[model samples]
Target: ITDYNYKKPLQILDKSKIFGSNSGSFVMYSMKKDKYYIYNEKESRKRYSPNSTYKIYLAMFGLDRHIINDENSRMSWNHKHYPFDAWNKEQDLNTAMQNSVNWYFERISDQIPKNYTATQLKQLNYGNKNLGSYKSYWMEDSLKISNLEQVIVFKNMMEQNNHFSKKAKNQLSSSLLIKKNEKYELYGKTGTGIGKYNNGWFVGYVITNHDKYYFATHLSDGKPSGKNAELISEKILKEMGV
Candidate 1:
C-alpha cells in the first residue's frame, strides 16, 4: 500500500491560481508533468466526508462484487419519497449516478456486508480506514478523504491498476462521463450534502489526446461551481489549458 502521502506530497502553494478560498481546497495532478498543483496545503490535507463523491467508488465496489451487475441494471425505488424528482422513479446505474441518487447507492451498499466493505476500503487504502454507520458514514463522517488523497485514488483508478477489475473501472469511467468532444473527454461526479458549513464536491479526470489529469475540489461552505465545487478547479484547469 502507498504510505498515504498525508502531509505534503508536492507543494505549489502561494500561487494565486492554485489556491482555494479559506473554506475549501482544490487539488490537481498533471500526469504529463508529473506534478501536483493545489490550493491551501492544510485544507488539502484536512479530511472530510466524501458526501456524494463516494459514489464513484461505490460504483466500483458494487460492480466488482456483482452486487450491481452492470450499468443497465435497474434498482427499484423504495417509494419512500425523496426531495428530488429525478430520484422519484426506478433508476438504472447511469441515471442514478447522473442524478446523484442517494437511496439507490445506499440500498446497494446495504447488500454488501459491512465487514466486506471495510476490507475493500482498506485494500484500496481509502482515507482513514474509518468506517462510520452502515448507512450514513460516507456522508456524515465515516469515510474521509483529503483532496490530494482523492487525486491519488482517482489516478489509480484511471490507470487500471487499482483494486478493481478493468471492467469495473471502465464501467465507472463510462458512468462519470460528463462531456465528450473531439479533443477531450471530461468525466466527473459532484457531491452535495455538507456538514460543518462545507457545501460541495466535484472529482474526476480529464482525458486529452495526449494525457490524463486527475482533480478534486471541495468547498467548506455553500458554494456552487460544478455544483460550485467545479468553480475553482475549472478555472485552474482552463488556465492550465487542460
Candidate 2:
C-alpha cells in the first residue's frame, strides 16, 4: 500500500501490436512529471514470480552484508557445468550480473540468513514477503510481484529510500548499467520464470538529462521470455523518445 501519488495513466494505443501474442503489462513512471504511463493496467497489478530479476536486489543484499565487496568482487565457480558457458568460469559481480549467474547469487543467498532476508523483504515492502525455499524462492511461485510494484521498487532504489547502505546501492547502480549515451543511460535486469507459470520480466529505469523513468515490462503466455520482454521494452522506450 505504498502511495505512488499516481497521475492519470497514459495510453500507448499500439501496445497490443507491440506485445504481439504474449499477454503482458508495461508500466513507466516519469520522475519529473510525476505521472504513470501504463498498458494493461489490470495485468500491471497482477503478481508473478520475480525469477532472475530478484538478482538485482540480491546484489544489494550481498553488498550490504559484506558478502561481496563491490562490482569487482569475485566468486569461484563450483566447477559444476552449467548450460551457459559464461557461467562455467569464475565470475566477478559485474560479469555474474550481466550473465545472470544463478549459482553466484545462490551462494550469496546461502550466506545471508533467511531471517535476515525476510526482514529485508518486509522492510523493502517487496511482493508477498515470502521466501518459501532457501534455494529457489524467486524462481518458484513463492516470491511474487506486480509490474507496477517492480517500477515502484526501482523508483525507491533510484531515490535511495530503502535501507541498503549507500555504498551497496552505489555499487549496485554501477553494476546495473546496460547502455549509456549522450542522451540517456539505461539500467535494468531481465528475469524468466520456469515450469508452467513461465512469466518474463524486464525491470529497470532510464535516465535522461531532464528526467528519470522507472519501468517494468512483464510477459506471460505464448512464447514469453525475459529477452523478449527486454526487446519489447526497448521498442516502446524508443518510440516514447526516452
Candidate 3:
C-alpha cells in the first residue's frame, strides 16, 4: 500500500483529480485524535441528505432502546428483489447491516416516533436540519453530518461503556469494524439516497490498535459520483498512520 511516495495515498487526489469523476460534494477522514483534514470540505456538508447513513443511528437507537431486542431480528421487504434495495423478502439485522438497502431500514423507521428519533439524534449534537422525507416518514432529520461529528461518534463507538451498554457497544463494533482485508475489523454504513440538495454518503467507524477512527465520505455530484465514496476511503485509509 505504501509503494508510492509516503504522501498519503490521496494527497495528490486532494487537488490533482477526483477519485470518481462524479464524486459528490466532499470527502473527509479523521483519526481518533486529530483535526479533520478535509480533502474537500467547503461545500460538502452545507447540503446533503443522510440517506442510508441514517440507518446506523437508527440501528444504534434500536439497540439502545427496547425497540429492537432480537439482535438477530429480521424483516422482509414486500417489494421486488434487487441487489441493493434490501428487497430480498426477509432480512435480519446482519443482512441489513451489509445490504445497505433502503427498504429494511425504512420499515424499522416506522416503529420509532419521529420526535423520539429526532431527539436521539440531537443528543449526538446533530440532526435538527431539514427532515425531508424523513419528516413525513416518522424518521429523524435527513440531516447532514460533518467530518467533526464522524470522529466524535467514532470516539464514542470505541469506548466499551460509551453510548449503549457494553454489549450494545460491542455490537456496534461489528457494524463499524468490518474486515476490509480480513486483517482487522471495521464497522460502518454506506448510503445512496436521492435528493435535489443531497449527496450520496458513506459513513462509519473503524478501530485500530486500542483507538477507533471514523470516516464520513460523501459524493456531491447530483448525477453520479461513481465509486468515489469508497475509493476515497480506500485512498484515505492508505494514508492512515498510527
Candidate 4:
C-alpha cells in the first residue's frame, strides 16, 4: 500500500465560497497522487461521530458475513408512521442504503453480535476502533472518525485494494452511484444528525475519464439538510477544477 499522510501538508486547493454561517471541515484527496487537501487542518483531524457515513463499512460487514446476500434482501416494517415516509414501507439493502434507513441497519445489527462488528472495525483499523453498542455506537458519541480518515477510507474503497471482501466492495460501490453525466460519474453518500453537536457528513468518490477523487465534507452547528454536504463538496470540487 502506498503511504498517504494527512498530517504531512500537501497543496491546499483554492477555496472560493465554502463557508456559511456555520462551522465544519472538508477534505479531498487525489488518489493517483495520494495527496490530501483539507479546509481546516485542526478541525479535519478532530474526531466526530460518523453518523450515516459508518454505513459504508456496516454494509460491507453484512455482505462479508452473509447477513445480507446482496442488495436485494428485504426488510419489512410494522406499518409504523415514521419520520421519513420513504422509510415506512419494506426496504431492501439497496433501498435502505439509498434512504439511509436507521431501522433497517439496526435490525441487522441486532442479529449480529457487537464483538463481531468491533472485530470488523479492527480489521480495517477504522477510526478509534469503537463500536459503542449493538445499536447506537456509530450514532453520536461512540464511533467517531475524523474528516481526514474518511478520505483515506473512501480511497481504499475505490481502489478495492483493501482487505474487504469483493462482494462487500461491489455492493457499496453500486449503492453509492448517484449520477453520471458526459464528464464524470459521481458516487457518494450523505450523512446528517441532530446529535449533541449538530453535524452532517458527505463522503465518497468521483471518477472522471482521467482521474478519481475522494472527498469527505463535514458540517457543524446547524440544521444542515442531507444534500448540504454534497452541495458543499461539489462547489469545492468545481472550484478546484475537478
Give lDDT per model, in order: 0.76, 0.83, 0.55, 0.75
TM-score of each: 0.88, 0.90, 0.73, 0.88
Per-residue alpha-carbon lDDT of candidate 1 for residues 99-214, written as tens digits (9 for 90 to 100): 98999888778888889888887776678778766766788566688878888877866674566777778778888898888888988998876424455788999999998889
Across 1-242, the per-residue lDDT of candidate 2 in tens digits comes to: 43232232334435888888888889998888888888988888777888999999888888888898954478898889889999999988888888999999988888988898998887777877767767678875577788888998768765865567777777787778899999999999999887354788999989899988989899988767999999999999998875
Better of 2 and 3 by TM-score: 2
| Candidate 4 lDDT over residue span 1-242, tens digit each | 12222353336653435757656778887767778887877777777778888777777777767787664567789787899998999887778888999888877676778778777776655677665545678877567778888887667655756667666677778888887888888888888876244778889888888888888888875545457888888888777755
Model 2 Cα shift for residue 66 (angstroms):
0.7
Off by over 4 Å in 2: 1-14, 195-197
Least well predicted 10-residue stretch by lDDT in candidate 1: 13-22
Off by over 4 Å in 3: 1-34, 79-86, 132-142, 151-163, 180-183, 195-198, 222-226, 239-242
TM-score of 4: 0.88
Q: Model 4 segments beyond 4 Å from truth?
A: 1-10, 14-16, 157-160, 195-197
Model 1 accuracy (lDDT, Cα): 0.76
Higher lDDT: candidate 1 or 3?
Answer: 1
Candidate 1 error regions (>4 Å): 1-5, 8-22, 195-197, 222-226
lDDT of model 4, residue 19: 58
- The better-scoring model by lDDT among 1 and 2 is 2
